[PDB]
Design a protein around this ligand. Structure first.
Ligand SMILES: CCCCCCCC/C=C\CCCCCCCC(=O)OC[C@H](COP(=O)(O)OCC[N+](C)(C)C)OC(=O)CCCCCCC/C=C\CCCCCCCC
Ligand SMILES: CCCCCCCC/C=C\CCCCCCCC(=O)OC[C@H](COP(=O)(O)OCC[N+](C)(C)C)OC(=O)CCCCCCC/C=C\CCCCCCCC
Ligand SMILES: CCCCCCCC/C=C\CCCCCCCC(=O)OC[C@H](COP(=O)(O)OCC[N+](C)(C)C)OC(=O)CCCCCCC/C=C\CCCCCCCC
Ligand SMILES: CCCCCCCC/C=C\CCCCCCCC(=O)OC[C@H](COP(=O)(O)OCC[N+](C)(C)C)OC(=O)CCCCCCC/C=C\CCCCCCCC
Ligand SMILES: CC(C)CCC[C@@H](C)[C@H]1CC[C@H]2[C@@H]3CC=C4C[C@@H](OC(=O)CCC(=O)O)CC[C@]4(C)[C@H]3CC[C@]12C
Ligand SMILES: CCCCCCCCCCCCCCCCCCOC[C@@H](O)COP(=O)(O)OCC[N+](C)(C)C
Ligand SMILES: CCCCCCCCCCCCCCCCCCOC[C@@H](O)COP(=O)(O)OCC[N+](C)(C)C
Ligand SMILES: CCCCCCCCCCCCCCCCCCOC[C@@H](O)COP(=O)(O)OCC[N+](C)(C)C
Ligand SMILES: CCCCCCCCCCCCCCCCCCOC[C@@H](O)COP(=O)(O)OCC[N+](C)(C)C
Ligand SMILES: CCCCCCCCCCCCCCCCCCOC[C@@H](O)COP(=O)(O)OCC[N+](C)(C)C
Ligand SMILES: CCCCCCCCCCCCCCCCCCOC[C@@H](O)COP(=O)(O)OCC[N+](C)(C)C
Ligand SMILES: CCCCCCCCCCCCCCCCCCOC[C@@H](O)COP(=O)(O)OCC[N+](C)(C)C
Ligand SMILES: *[C@@H]1O[C@H](CO)[C@@H](O[C@@H]2O[C@H](CO)[C@@H](O)[C@H](O)[C@H]2NC(C)=O)[C@H](O)[C@H]1NC(C)=O
Ligand SMILES: *[C@@H]1O[C@H](CO)[C@@H](O)[C@H](O)[C@H]1NC(C)=O
Ligand SMILES: *[C@@H]1O[C@H](CO)[C@@H](O)[C@H](O)[C@H]1NC(C)=O
Ligand SMILES: *[C@@H]1O[C@H](CO)[C@@H](O)[C@H](O)[C@H]1NC(C)=O
Ligand SMILES: *[C@@H]1O[C@H](CO)[C@@H](O)[C@H](O)[C@H]1NC(C)=O
Ligand SMILES: *[C@@H]1O[C@H](CO)[C@@H](O)[C@H](O)[C@H]1NC(C)=O
Lengths: 1273, 173
């Protein structure tokens, strides 16, 4: 008990040695409470003064037999040492060891080490240190040597059981010390310095609670073993498919036909070095670093007249973008899975190979980018949930008085607090009215409004300060926040632009009455509260990655700058200094790494940059994901427990609401009192007949067929409709027929159901609205009103006919029901996000109002320098002197709050954010020419916005969505909400497949030779040998590369033939010892089918390559080789289980995909109707536009993932000259003008991306539920 | 953008008519300088005779009786890069019937390269006394009325058969 305390003396050591000797002559787990680095139990009470920081006996009986002692500090933390002398010189009773132990266990020692490490980390941020820092580095080395000297002589060195070298974290300190001394005595700065960066990792061993976080992260990694195996297998299979399909396609270029001086392509290609000379022979678009890609098919890119397509030269993007070898194909597939700049690769591949290959990208995206990320997410979520379960399981186991009191009475909750809430809302609304082209009177009224609001807020603060005591004022955190905001406002009144935006933080005061905003505040508080250690670990990792990158590639970005920049100046993103390196790391964490990959590999080599970037991605994404799930589940369950009632203390808003309910009702009742004081059998059979007709299955089938035909008739109305007069006329008459048929349907439904029943149905209402619009359009066309403006705008509404298919198919119906059930919970979080983004938008408008204007040289699109033309007036003079000059402004900017909202949407999606970032960091003032990175530290605004308005916002949204879907599932009895009844039956039948008990073993045969073959094949040795044979075949397929010699081709062909013969022999042997029991196993059926497919495919490929000319079909049927390596999943149980989970998720995914396809079809028809004639610039070009249904679907599939939607939106925003031409004449059509409608385009793109996000979230949740069900059963 | 539509093959005597000739460049972003020449051969003759040439925003007409004062340029305006090279005949006459070829000569200006290219497009135009309705409108309309009449007979017939059946149930009641 508490009395078990005594100093460790020589007699105790002698007794321990005697006990050890007795145990040896004769020839259990210690208490976790008494483990090293733990608090002393309270059962022992306080420590008497004379033994703190002194050697005493071992309280743990386990070690009571062995030679150990415990020392206790003033914080009741026990430390375990060894009683064996350190290096056989210093005894425990020696004064020197006593001093060393006194130093070791002390708060000041840890504080000194932490301060030293922090100062060294600060000094690591200087890329070009002065000559005075050498002494400071020497001081740091001396301090580290001092601390490593105490420990080494306190616990010994690898000589004891509890000695210095046994601590895994002590190895880092030893390595730091030896590296520093060795590199000092021996003397590249690149390496030695990059190795000194390890002193930053010592923060984990000095800040308490960080080792546990690191161990938890390692444990979370350890549970991801099978998922990474499946990911690598899938990426390799898709890389082989892409290598087969697109080998050398990205090398196609437009080579000129006419060459003088008897010159040939071969002779040209070896005398070309500069792009200026390359441009003379190949076709380059203006401002393009790479040559224009082409293809030999009719759906690929088209060379200009005078140029022919040829495969010659290097690949695009410094030759890093290709499918030439397995390595580059694997890198491209990883890029597709991570969805980093994948739209550029998608567009290049379509241009070089044809639009028909969009199927490959659809399949690869839907599988590698969706399902594998889902698996990683689900497994990491399981790991964290199990860790949390274990943690919670083990944790549970005079005159002044009179007047100041009168003021307190003046403070009344129902009115004063409601008045202050109204004032806060009014102030936010008033400050949201700032814009750039704003007159002086508007500025004056805004200034006086802000002044009066600040005055009333200060008056409130003073009145509350004199009502309650100043000490009574300061316990409430809200009161402290309000006082701080008031002092900041007063400081601004006495006097930057950022300080004026600190008043918007008062909006969070509404969280006392707004429950959902309080959830966001709780998430933000937990980010630095219960989960502060994880956030600190993430910050340390980011800092380490930034400094490591700056050390490795800082000088390379400067010496090799001309390789990545024609001007020979450092690009926008680089690692020359600490700030830009940190910006690169943050951008990588956001998900953009390939474009910086290219520059890094150009300046410093492929291997180093690849290794560094992959490590950064893996570690950073793992930590960010762990933090995300930690916050999500903590605020999901631990924070919300209904401990208190709804506003246990009567909320002031609730009191005001009750007072209003009393007053308004009483006044209305008194007013009412004052007013009173002052003063058919045959018809029924017809209804019976129409009911029978409507509900029959043939009626349903006929109407579904007509709906499908009517929807499909819309795809034909593209810009080429004037070349198809017959089809156009047939379409008009068919539309008339469809209108008649749907009029008849509407009449029959009216007769059968009745007006009440028909008009109480939402689907019937939608059908009625669509048919009414169609009837109005038809009658207007008949009555000659076919060219009116309103009628022409109504005619574009025929894109809503596919909405009639929602009620006809059960999958879309159930998905729509789930979405409508979820909508009410989505709305409140949408409002909270709007308020938060409004605060950020007001801040952005304040910072960047009208500062994005610049004077450019139009013909090349280059901003003029600031030495000349630094003002708007100088730009005006330059325009009226030189024609190709323009003082233009960005289309998406922070001119007002709506444009700020659009800019924030672009930033949050990380699509088009770079232009806004550059314009913000270059901004100077209003009517001032921007200078390169003049406001360099404006990047902090965007980083803070990204963090707060993306990480926490998405966290809150997903947290509420999980609650909504859990309640939806619970309400209907726990059944799946995305599956129909028949789908449920098939799901149960599939579930019985994956839980079958071991079947009856296949009996041996009576024949001797057949029996020997039987005992041969059924051996596990046969299975493992077949697995290694399949692995060798996969390696053989990987060896293939673009440009290989004919000898290699023949060798690989013969190796593949040998493998095919071996697999055929395997199949034949199996067919004899198994007899007809071979077909009783599905895996054997798959093996049979793949052997047949391999033999047939190789025969057909040989026949085509020998006696035909069709490379495309040759590759398509040579893709059958992939079947052989798909058999590897038989041997691996984990990836087989994951594939079973995917097969489980398939039906719900099919329903959600049907809904998404219908939405995409509607949006494609609308885009064809609207943006078919928009100018071809930015993301719109000859191959990716809205001219054709195929083109529209190509564009919409790209932006279903949010990829490149800014580039598509930008051309539409042109509305007035010189941006567009309102009277542009298009040959072959009567449509005039190439301008776009900004409002229609903005609504189109914003609504589509929002709907796509909702549908993708639904798919994510369905897959995760199917994954959780499979693993936990 | 630019769509190559074929010219209508039918012209009505005494009215106006436009002969379409659209030749779009393979890439829209390129720059070129285009001029066109039109050649016409009447029925009963086997030789093609040049009738007009358009270049640099000025139209030049050959001295031919059949086309003097009844041809105006309907085509691209304001540019030396022309993708609609069409012509309009102000009063059609029987002599106009015959086969017309539009030859477009385009010089495409490229970096270090100029390619000169030619396209010949052939139109056959027949002057007719009165306009003649397309077979497709005539066939489609007859089919829309036959489908609308066929569907109405199936609904009326099915209803008559069902009502007879339901009537029996009420009596059986
Ligand atoms: C924490 C731990 C996390 C993991 C960290 C380590 C991760 C990755 C390490 C990768 C090591 C890369 C070494 C490459 C060595 C090298 O120098 O490579 C040489 C070859 C051949 O280059 P070449 O001269 O023929 O190219 C033509 C020249 N050109 C392109 C300029 C025109 O390069 C090639 O094959 C290009 C190599 C492409 C493969 C990149 C890796 C695959 C993608 C992502 C990994 C997924 C995880
Ligand atoms: C998680 C996602 C959250 C939601 C994000 C959605 C994306 C962002 C939303 C919208 C972005 C674009 C909004 C419009 C941008 C400004 C465009 C503009 O130039 O607008 C100007 C107009 C006023 O025109 P004027 O001064 O030229 O009239 C002159 C009249 N004369 C000539 C007679 C003097 O003002 C206006 O449109 C401003 C009023 C309308 C727009 C208000 C801001 C957006 C509000 C709600 C969005 C809800 C989304 C769900
Ligand atoms: C790129 C790489 C992707 C590879 C896809 C295809 C790989 C090969 C399989 C297709 C042919 C299958 C031949 C016959 C399979 C017989 C069989 O056994 O079918 C079910 C097996 C696993 O059954 P189990 O009871 O051993 O484990 C599941 C039960 N649990 C959860 C308790 C562990 O599922 C499986 O192999 C998964 C079958 C479903 C695969 C569909 C995904 C591709 C689309
Ligand atoms: C690029 C590559 C191009 C070439 C690819 C070639 C190979 C691709 C497709 C061929 C697939 C052939 C069919 C495979 C499954 C055959 C089968 O019979 O499969 C049954 C299993 C479950 O059979 P069981 O183990 O319960 O035994 C049942 C025993 N009996 C039947 C006697 C009662 O079905 C299941 O699991 C369902 C598994 C569904 C797998 C779909 C894979 C799609 C890819
Ligand atoms: C509920 C959330 C979603 C919004 C709450 C804030 C609104 C009250 C803000 C957001 C957008 C604001 C508008 C954004 C842009 C403009 C245009 C602005 O005028 C100009 O830009 C042109 C000035 C000129 O050239 O004379 C006048 C204010 C106004 C209507 C703003 C009025 C206040 C609005 C509606
Ligand atoms: C859901 C998945 C994503 C959407 C998929 C929609 C269906 C798939 C839509 O695919 C459209 C493409 O096929 C269009 O490109 P093509 O090369 O086929 O066009 C050929 C045109 N010519 C040359 C014949 C005239
Ligand atoms: C518009 O036309 C609808 C008709 O085709 C009606 O035919 P049904 O599809 O209703 O035919 C089956 C109806 N009964 C006869 C089975 C009730
Ligand atoms: C389940 C819901 C299903 C909804 C289906 C809606 C209709 C879906 C119809 O899909 C196919 C059409 O889009 C094809 O349109 P095209 O114009 O490409 O076809 C003709 C092409 N040529 C011949 C002119 C080149
Ligand atoms: C400018 C033009 C803008 C056009 C906008 C068009 C928006 C269309 C939105 C359609 C949105 C989808 O259609 C509405 C239906 O969802 C309503 O019916 P419910 O889903 O509530 O039915 C549930 C199932 N029971 C309860 C009836 C059985
Ligand atoms: C987004 C695109 C998603 C594409 C998914 C493709 C793979 C999924 C394609 O369907 C996979 C089938 O196993 C289930 O198909 P169904 O849901 O049509 O049939 C379910 C069972 N009943 C209804 C027939 C009884
Ligand atoms: C399921 C969906 C099935 C349909 C998928 C989309 C098919 C889409 C089929 O599109 C056919 C054409 O409209 C494409 O025309 P292009 O843009 O290639 O230009 C042709 C130019 N010339 C050759 C006429 C001069
Ligand atoms: C389901 C999600 C629904 C999301 C819809 C949200 C979109 C709303 C914003 C549409 C966008 C709001 O429309 C009006 C503005 O776009 C006006 O823009 P401008 O003033 O630039 O117009 C050009 C000439 N001045
Ligand atoms: C805007 O920038 C110009 C840059 O020189 C300022 O300087 C004037 O420039 C014009 C032509 O270059 C001269 O005619 C003036 O005499 C220059 N004045 C001065 C004071 O240098 C100009 O003052 C600036 N205008 C504004 C509105 O700030
Ligand atoms: C081919 O090139 C050679 C280069 O010396 C030149 O002398 C010769 O005239 C050329 N012949 C033709 C056919 O252009
Ligand atoms: C600027 O340009 C014109 C020529 O277009 C020049 O003659 C004059 O100095 C300036 N005119 C105006 C209106 O500023
Ligand atoms: C063309 O001119 C003739 C007279 O030669 C005239 O009768 C005819 O109406 C004119 N047609 C048109 C369309 O002007
Ligand atoms: C064609 O010429 C006629 C008569 O000169 C004219 O009315 C018509 O507008 C012109 N059309 C075009 C597009 O040039
Ligand atoms: C048209 O040309 C024919 C050539 O035989 C001539 O006879 C006829 O009079 C001409 N008609 C006119 C006035 O265009």
């Amino acid at each position: 008990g508490p009395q078990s305390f005594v100093h460790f003396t020589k007699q105790s050591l002698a007794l321990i040695e005697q006990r050890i000797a007795e145990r040896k002559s004769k020839e259990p787990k210690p208490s976790s409470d008494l483990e090293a680095g733990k608090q002393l139990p309270f059962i022992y009470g306080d420590i008497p003064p004379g033994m703190v920081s002194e050697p005493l006996e071992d309280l743990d009986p386990y070690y009571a037999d062995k030679k150990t002692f415990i020392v206790l500090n003033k914080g009741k933390t026990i430390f375990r040492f060894n009683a064996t002398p350190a290096l056989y010189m210093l005894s425990p009773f020696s004064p020197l060891r006593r001093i060393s132990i006194k130093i070791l266990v002390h708060s000041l020692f840890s504080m000194l080490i932490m301060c030293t490490i922090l100062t060294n980390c600060i000094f690591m941020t200087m890329n070009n240190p002065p000559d005075w820092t050498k002494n400071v580095e020497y001081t740091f080395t001396g301090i580290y040597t001092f601390e490593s000297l105490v420990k080494i002589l306190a616990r010994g060195f690898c000589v004891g059981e509890f000695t210095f070298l046994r601590d895994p974290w002590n190895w880092l300190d030893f390595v730091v010390i030896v590296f520093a001394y060795l590199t000092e005595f021996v003397n590249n700065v690149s390496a030695l310095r990059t190795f000194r960066v390890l002193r930053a990792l010592k923060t984990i061993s000095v800040i308490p609670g960080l080792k546990t976080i690191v161990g938890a992260l390692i444990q979370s990694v350890k549970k991801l073993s099978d998922v990474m195996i499946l990911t690598v297998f899938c990426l390799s299979v898709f890389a082989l498919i892409g290598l087969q399909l697109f080998m050398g396609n990205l090398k196609h270029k437009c080579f000129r036909n006419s060459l003088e001086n008897n010159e040939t392509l071969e002779s040209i290609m070896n005398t070309l070095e500069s792009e200026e000379d390359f441009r003379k022979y190949f076709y380059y678009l203006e401002g393009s670093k790479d040559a224009l890609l082409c293809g030999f098919s009719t759906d690929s890119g088209q060379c200009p007249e005078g140029y022919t397509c040829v495969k010659i030269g290097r690949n695009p993007d410094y030759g890093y973008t290709s499918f030439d070898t397995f390595s580059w194909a694997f890198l491209a597939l990883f890029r597709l899975m991570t969805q980093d700049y994948w739209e550029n690769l998608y567009q290049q591949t379509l241009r070089a190979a044809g639009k028909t290959y969009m199927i490959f990208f659809v399949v690869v995206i839907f599988l590698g980018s969706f399902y594998l990320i889902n698996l990683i997410l689900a497994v990491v979520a399981m790991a964290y949930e199990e860790q949390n379960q274990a943690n919670i399981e083990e944790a549970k186991q005079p005159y002044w008085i009179k007047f100041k009191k009168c003021i307190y009475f003046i403070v009344m909750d129902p009115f004063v607090d409601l008045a202050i809430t109204i004032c806060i809302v009014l102030n936010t609304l008033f400050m949201a009215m700032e814009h750039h082209p704003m007159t002086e009177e508007f500025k004056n009224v805004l200034a006086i409004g802000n002044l009066v609001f600040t005055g009333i807020f200060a008056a409130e603060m003073v009145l509350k300060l004199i009502a309650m005591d100043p000490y009574e004022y300061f316990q409430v955190g809200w009161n402290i926040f309000d006082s701080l905001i008031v002092t900041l406002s007063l400081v601004e009144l006495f006097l930057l632009s950022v300080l004026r935006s600190f008043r918007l933080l008062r909006v969070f005061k509404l969280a006392k009455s707004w429950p959902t905003l309080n959830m966001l505040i709780k998430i933000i508080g937990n980010s630095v509260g219960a989960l502060g250690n994880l956030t600190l670990v993430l910050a340390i990792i980011v800092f380490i990655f930034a400094v490591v990158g700056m050390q490795l590639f800082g000088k390379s970005y400067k010496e090799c700058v001309c390789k990545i920049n024609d001007d020979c100046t450092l690009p926008r993103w680089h690692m020359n200094d600490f700030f830009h390196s940190f910006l690169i790391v943050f951008r990588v964490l956001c998900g953009e790494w390939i474009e910086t990959m290219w520059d890094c590999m150009e300046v410093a080599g492929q291997a180093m940059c690849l290794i560094v970037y992959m490590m950064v991605m893996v570690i950073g994404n793992l930590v960010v994901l762990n933090l995300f799930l930690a916050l999500l589940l903590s605020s999901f369950s631990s924070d919300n427990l209904t401990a208190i009632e709804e506003d246990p203390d009567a909320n002031n808003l609730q009191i005001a609401v009750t007072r209003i309910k009393k007053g308004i009702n009483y006044v209305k009742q008194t007013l009412r009192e004052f007013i009173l004081k002052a003063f058919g059998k045959i018809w029924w059979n017809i209804r019976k007949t129409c009911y029978k007709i409507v509900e029959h299955s043939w009626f349903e089938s006929f109407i579904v067929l007509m709906i499908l035909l009517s929807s499909g008739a819309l795809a034909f109305e593209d810009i080429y409709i004037e070349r198809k007069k017959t089809i156009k006329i047939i379409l008009e008459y068919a539309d008339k027929i469809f209108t008649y048929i749907f009029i008849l349907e509407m009449l029959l439904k009216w007769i059968a159901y009745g007006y009440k029943t028909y008009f109480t149905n939402a689907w019937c209402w939608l059908d009625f609205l669509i048919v009414d619009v169609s009837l109005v359009t038809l009658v207007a066309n008949t009555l000659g009103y076919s060219d009116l403006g309103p009628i022409k705008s109504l005619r574009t509404l025929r894109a809503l006919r596919p909405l009639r298919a929602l009620s006809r198919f059960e999958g879309m119906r159930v998905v729509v029901n789930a979405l409508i059930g979820a909508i009410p919970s989505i709305m409140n979080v949408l409002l909270v996000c709007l308020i938060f983004w409004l605060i950020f938008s007001i801040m952005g408008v304040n910072l960047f109002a009208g500062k994005f204007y610049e004077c450019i040289n139009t013909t090349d699109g280059s901003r003029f320098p600031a030495s000349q033309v630094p003002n708007r007036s100088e730009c005006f003079a330059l325009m009226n002197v030189s024609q190709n000059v323009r003082w233009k402004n960005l289309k998406v900017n922070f001119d007002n709050v709506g444009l700020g909202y659009l800019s924030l949407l672009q930033v949050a999606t990380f699509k088009g954010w770079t232009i806004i970032m550059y314009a913000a960091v270059d901004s100077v003032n209003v009517d001032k020419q921007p200078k390169y990175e003049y406001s360099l530290y404006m990047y902090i605004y965007f980083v803070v916005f990204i963090i707060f308005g993306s990480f926490f916002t998405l966290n809150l949204f997903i947290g509420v969505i999980i609650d909504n879907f859990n309640q939806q599932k619970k309400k209907l009895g726990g059944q799946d909400i995305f599956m129909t009844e028949e789908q449920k039956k098939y799901y149960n039948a599939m579930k019985k497949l994956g839980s079958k008990k071991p079947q009856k073993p296949i009996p041996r045969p009576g024949n001797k030779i057949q029996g020997c073959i039987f005992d041969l094949v059924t051996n596990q040795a046969f299975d493992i040998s077949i697995m290694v044979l399949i692995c060798l075949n996969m390696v053989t397929m990987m060896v293939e590369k673009e440009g290989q010699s004919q000898h290699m081709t023949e060798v690989l062909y013969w190796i593949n033939v040998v493998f095919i013969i071996l697999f055929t022999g395997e199949c034949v042997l199996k067919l004899i010892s198994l007899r007809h029991y071979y077909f009783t196993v599905g895996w054997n059926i798959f093996d049979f089918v793949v052997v047949i497919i391999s033999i047939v495919g190789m025969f057909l490929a040989d026949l085509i390559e020998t006696y035909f000319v069709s490379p495309t079909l040759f590759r398509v049927i040579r893709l059958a080789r992939i079947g052989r390596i798909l058999r590897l999943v038989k041997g691996a149980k984990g990836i087989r289980t994951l594939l079973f989970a995917l097969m489980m998720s398939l039906p719900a995914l099919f329903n959600i995909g049907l809904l998404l396809f219908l939405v995409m079809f509607i949006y494609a028809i609308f885009g064809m109707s609207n943006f078919a004639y928009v100018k071809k610039e930015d993301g719109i070009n000859d191959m990716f536009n809205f001219e054709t249904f195929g083109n529209s679907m190509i564009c919409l599939f790209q932006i279903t993932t949010s990829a490149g939607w800014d580039g598509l939106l930008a051309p539409i925003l042109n509305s007035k000259p010189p941006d567009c031409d309102p009277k542009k004449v298009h040959p072959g059509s009567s449509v005039e003008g190439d301008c776009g409608n900004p409002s229609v385009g903005i609504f189109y793109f914003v609504s589509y991306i929002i709907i796509s996000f909702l549908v993708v979230v639904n798919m994510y949740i369905a897959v995760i539920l199917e994954n959780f069900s499979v693993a936990t059963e | 953008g630019c769509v190559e539509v074929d010219s209508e093959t039918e012209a009505v005597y005494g009215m106006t008519f436009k002969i379409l000739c659209i030749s779009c460049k393979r890439r829209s972003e390129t720059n070129a300088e285009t001029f066109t020449e039109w050649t016409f051969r009447q029925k009963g003759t086997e030789e093609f005779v040049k009738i007009l040439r358009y270049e640099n925003e000025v139209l030049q007409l050959e001295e031919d009786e059949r086309f003097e004062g009844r041809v105006v340029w309907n085509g691209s305006r304001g540019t030396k890069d022309l993708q609609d090279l069409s012509i309009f005949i102000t009063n059609v006459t029987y002599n106009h019937s015959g086969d017309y070829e539009c030859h477009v000569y385009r010089l495409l200006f490229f970096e270090n390269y100029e390619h000169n290219t030619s396209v010949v497009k052939k139109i056959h135009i027949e002057v007719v006394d009165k306009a003649n309705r397309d077979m497709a409108s005539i066939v489609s309309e007859i089919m829309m009325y036959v489908l609308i009449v066929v569907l109405t007979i199936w609904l009326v017939a099915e209803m008559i058969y069902c009502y007879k059946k339901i009537a029996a149930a009420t009596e059986t009641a």
